[PDB]
Structure 1
Amino acid sequence: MKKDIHPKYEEITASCSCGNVMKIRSTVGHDLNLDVCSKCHPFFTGKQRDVATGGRVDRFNKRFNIPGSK
């Protein structure tokens, strides 16, 4: 520690308690613990029957009465 090797050590020492908000701490970063694969795909998910996103109003059996006077 000669005098002229100029550290920035007043700044590096300063501001020393940093929050989880301020600079995350060493209390953050193990949080997503493990690297996860699940090989029980859709259709292994107990779904032996399938259905689309939405359109679920008025479900009953009507045999193709959809044309307006054909």
Structure 2
Amino acid sequence: MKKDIHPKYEEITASCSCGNVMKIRSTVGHDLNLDVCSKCHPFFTGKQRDVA
């Protein structure tokens, strides 16, 4: 990468309502509150209620 033309990309910690505490690099520059994660999202139950 070059010097400071890029935005500040610092490691933060995301946390959703699934109890999934997950630290990641993201250039938000702030800690994060979520609801849906990849763990415990209604994807398969969503497909089931779709077909049903």
* Rg larger for: 1
Larger strand proportion, structure 1 or 2? 2
d(CA) in 1 for partners of 2:42, 2:30? 29
Name the stretch that deviates more: 38-47 or 14-23.
Answer: 38-47
Secondary structure of 1:11 counterpart: strand
Residue segments in structure 1 that go unaligned for 5+ positions in a row: 53-70
Normalised by the length of structure 1, the TM-score is 0.15
> After the TM superposition, which parts of structure 1 deviate over 2 Å for at least 4 consecutive aligned residues?
11-52
Tell me the alpha carbon deviations over residues 10-59 of structure 1, each in whole angstroms, 9 at most, x when there is no partner.
1457889994589999999999999999999999999999999xxxxxxx
d(CA) in 1 for partners of 2:18, 2:6? 25
Normalised by the length of structure 2, the TM-score is 0.17
Name the stretch that deviates more: 14-23 or 3-12.
Answer: 14-23
Quickly say closer, same or farther: Cα 1:24–1:17, change in 2 above 3 A: farther
- The number of residues matched between the two structures is 52
Question: How big is the shift at 1:9?
Answer: 0.8
Secondary structure of 2:49 counterpart: coil
Task: Point out which structure has higher relative CO (alpha carbons under 8 A, 6+ apart).
Answer: 2
Residue segments in structure 2 that go unaligned for 5+ positions in a row: none
Name the stretch that deviates more: 12-21 or 30-39.
Answer: 30-39
